[PDB]
Ligand binder design. Sequence first.
Ligand SMILES: Nc1nc2c(ncn2[C@@H]2O[C@H](COP(=O)(O)OP(=O)(O)OP(=O)(O)O)[C@@H](O)[C@H]2O)c(=O)[nH]1
Ligand SMILES: Nc1nc2c(ncn2[C@@H]2O[C@H](COP(=O)(O)OP(=O)(O)OP(=O)(O)O)[C@@H](O)[C@H]2O)c(=O)[nH]1
Ligand SMILES: [Mg+2]
Ligand SMILES: [Mg+2]
Lengths: 31, 44, 37, 61, 38, 440, 427
Amino acid sequence: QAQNQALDREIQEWESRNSAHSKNQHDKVKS
Amino acid sequence: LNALRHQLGLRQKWLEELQLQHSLRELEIAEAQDSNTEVAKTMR
Amino acid sequence: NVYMEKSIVTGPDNYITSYDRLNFHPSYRVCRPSICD
Amino acid sequence: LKRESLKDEKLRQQVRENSAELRELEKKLKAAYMNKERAAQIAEKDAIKYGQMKRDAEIAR
Amino acid sequence: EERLKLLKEHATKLLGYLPKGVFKNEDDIDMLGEEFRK
Amino acid sequence: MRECISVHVGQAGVQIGNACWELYCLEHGIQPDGQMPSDKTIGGGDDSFNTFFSETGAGKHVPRAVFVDLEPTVIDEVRTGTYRQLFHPEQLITGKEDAANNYARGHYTIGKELIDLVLDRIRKLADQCTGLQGFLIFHSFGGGTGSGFTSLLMERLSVDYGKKSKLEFSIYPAPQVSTAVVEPYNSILTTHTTLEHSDCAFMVDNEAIYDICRRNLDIERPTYTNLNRLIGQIVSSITASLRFDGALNVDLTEFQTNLVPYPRIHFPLATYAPVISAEKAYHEQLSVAEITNACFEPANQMVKCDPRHGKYMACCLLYRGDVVPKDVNAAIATIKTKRTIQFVDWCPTGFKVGINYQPPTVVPGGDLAKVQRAVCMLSNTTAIAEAWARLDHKFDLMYAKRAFVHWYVGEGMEEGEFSEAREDMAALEKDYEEVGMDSV
Amino acid sequence: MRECISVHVGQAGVQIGNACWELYCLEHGIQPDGQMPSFNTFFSETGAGKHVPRAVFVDLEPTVIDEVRTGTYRQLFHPEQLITGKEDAANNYARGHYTIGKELIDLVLDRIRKLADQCTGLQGFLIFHSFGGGTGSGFTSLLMERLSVDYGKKSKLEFSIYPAPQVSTAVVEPYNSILTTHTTLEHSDCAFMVDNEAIYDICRRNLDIERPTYTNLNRLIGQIVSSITASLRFDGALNVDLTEFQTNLVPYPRIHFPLATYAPVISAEKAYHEQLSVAEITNACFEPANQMVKCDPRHGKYMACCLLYRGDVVPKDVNAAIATIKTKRTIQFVDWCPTGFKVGINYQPPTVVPGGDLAKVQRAVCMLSNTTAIAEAWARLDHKFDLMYAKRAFVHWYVGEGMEEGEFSEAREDMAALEKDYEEVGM
Ligand SMILES: Nc1nc2c(ncn2[C@@H]2O[C@H](COP(=O)(O)OP(=O)(O)OP(=O)(O)O)[C@@H](O)[C@H]2O)c(=O)[nH]1
Ligand SMILES: Nc1nc2c(ncn2[C@@H]2O[C@H](COP(=O)(O)OP(=O)(O)OP(=O)(O)O)[C@@H](O)[C@H]2O)c(=O)[nH]1
Ligand SMILES: [Mg+2]
Ligand SMILES: [Mg+2]
């Protein structure tokens, strides 16, 4: 069992960081 | 335990997906600088 | 010990799972493709 | 008679493959043909599934 | 008249499955099918 | 060429969607088959379908609307009823099991599963869309699907598109007689996801519909069907200028820089003055002078907030029918000189007018009568802070004993997130107090 | 002149041919019987209106062909062309190549010459098979090798079924597939590959059909084997011959294993509500789920892509659509291929098979791309081999039957290269 949710903490770190990358088009038309 | 190992199996299978959307995105974001600079070379 | 994980979207297609998302019918779109948002 | 019959048919062809108004209408008259065969395909899949519903009752009976 | 020949020949069979911009200028249908209900 | 996207979320998303999309198809010609009538086909002389309806080459008009919820028991009647074939079948997303009428299921537990699917059905629509005028969010602050799913939509839609206007449509709970017990927990926290992740969010109550049916429509047993019909009319009234021309045309991009001075006060009322039965429209003359007077009546309002103890800070008017702009200018001037209607000192202009030529359409079997002209009335009154003052105390009374919270924290919720939701709403109770204060 | 001659071999290979000729017949007009009520490419004229086919279905064992010649399209196939045998190769490359194949090695060869001599300009062959069982493994190779000299240089195309990831109707599958690679590798031209696990999904994800058989999949395989040959048969604008596909998809020699993906694969109900335009279609073939091989394109690099567009596509929107997919960064294209987009707009809207599973689309596309992603695939099937070979399992037969353990080691080093040889293409 121990390995299973150990990846889930990895998944959630790798999930919320994906929520953060979008937080961080014009390059055509305008430019 | 077999179902738990099977349920384990979908998890790093899903982790491989996250690293892939990751690596596609640095390729997608680091380039945007390159295309910004390439157009900027025309712009300057 | 055979059992199939049921989908959550009630369509015959769209075999979605709480851990297997990104698993549905890819999109109509004219300009860009599915993987370049 | 062969001369003038060739004249009209192929001048009709010249304005057939050049005028975009005709090609605009030629495209959708095949899209009308599509709606007939689609609805034929809609009607057929209900007819083919009628094939095994009598078979499903037959093997159960 | 090349429209006329094309609408005489590939449109009469297609009565309810017809697309949108086919019969411009209503008088097109008067030289066609007798009831035809547009 | 102007066009918009209308997303409907929840059972309360689709009941208006069933009662508003039947309006739009009767607006121009469209059958509940998606097919334009045969005596509209001649020459293709209509571009006023393109705002709400797309067009496959065959001739079926497919709508720009995705219907998503976690309750499969209400979209299945759309897949069974008269409008089975109007809606695109992969654009109607249903979960197996409900959101259990709590925000924690609809935002963290199950709502994360269906979100990436429905973004792809949004970029379905935006990629067919040349210039998006805006989005139209449809939900309710009742429970899980109506508040959890849309708030994680709001978080993902604001970061996908960014600088882009987006209207919102949500019903609001009661001051007195509510139909849910765990509902007041939702409205405090879902506003926290709405203050900075929404362009503008209208004020509509279903209880005023009940009382408008009492006094104006003169109908016994106000059902839920005619309740969504009036809010079905009002989305048509605000977006009529997207389809049809007018003397003063108004696009959806006009609307956001028209009402809100601050990026966190996007909360306007929305009433429909010429609401009347068949029998009573026969005796009242309906000119623009007197139906504009009926806009500001507290009985003819939309939310249980009497505006006589609230300051009008911004308003916009959208007129439909044979509307002459001179008698508009006479009717507004009578309102300005009316003493009992109060304003804010920093906004001496106050009103914005918009004109459309076409008269409203009446659904067969409906209670609304064919009126010769229509007026849509949209204002962000400061009296709406009292609705929060009667809602936050209801939230505080239940939070004082920490009741009905074990269902939240079980489904992955943090206790401290409610406190900062309250602390931010404490600023709003001061924000409306520091806006209506007179200049010194 | 423009002519083709297939060699459908192996239960799968032949079943594939069955559905294929069904569409072939309809496309031209041939009635099941073989008489008609621009085709030479697949149907040979005779005396009284009779257009007999131009293939040579094989099968070391009886069955299959039995019904094939006593059912529906019975007359059409020439009694001779259909060659059977008298026993199966029991998923043994040995039996198929060096034991039971020999028997028929000549009968096919000789019948083949006939079909060959008869035509005048065979653009090339089309050995359709399935790496899974002896006949479809040993014999297929045994045929390609001998054909290499008896028919000289000539498009030796091949559309087979490569073992899918998890799904596997065979235990020794690894051995047969790997052992068959060392052959074609040098004696092939373009192994257009297609799996089954992926073709099932594509028929549920996009065709809304669960519990699917091998028949629905057969129809799909066809639509692809039609667009790869439509430019030679029917007419249209930009057109592509089998010769071209080669010098436009096969970059280096060994690297010769292109993928495939039909696009407007939509049901009827779903189509009535969804348009389909050059743009959408193309913008949906490069997706990582419309692929007929579980190999995901993203995990690699596109080295080439031949986008055939059998449909009323206009030769302008296509150019625009390609330009988009080009500038996307997501779909990565190796630098060595500055361009990397062959086209081909045939003007014959795809045909709908009576009681099939697809909807008639005015426009359709079949982009056969070459991505270093097939590399991953080979390795996964390779892994299974190593394991089975480490314990020399299922070698008792295979080897001691008509072959030597040397091949079991040679196939490895050679395959080890193909995978390594693919890697360098990327860098
Ligand atoms: N305007 C309008 N509102 C309705 C109608 N029917 C129900 N409602 C409202 O819908 C609200 C229920 O809120 P929700 O929690 O969002 O219900 P839901 O959409 O099923 O979402 P979940 O319960 O979380 O699954 C009730 O408070 C009703 O007031 C209707 O026909 N028209
Ligand atoms: N696409 C498709 N694939 C099929 C079909 N039938 C079988 N297959 C695949 O082919 C495999 C069976 O073919 P083979 O194992 O090569 O059988 P064979 O060709 O007769 O060779 P032997 O086993 O030696 O007799 C199965 O594992 C399937 O994956 C079909 O109808 N369509
Ligand atoms: Mg509910
Ligand atoms: Mg066999």
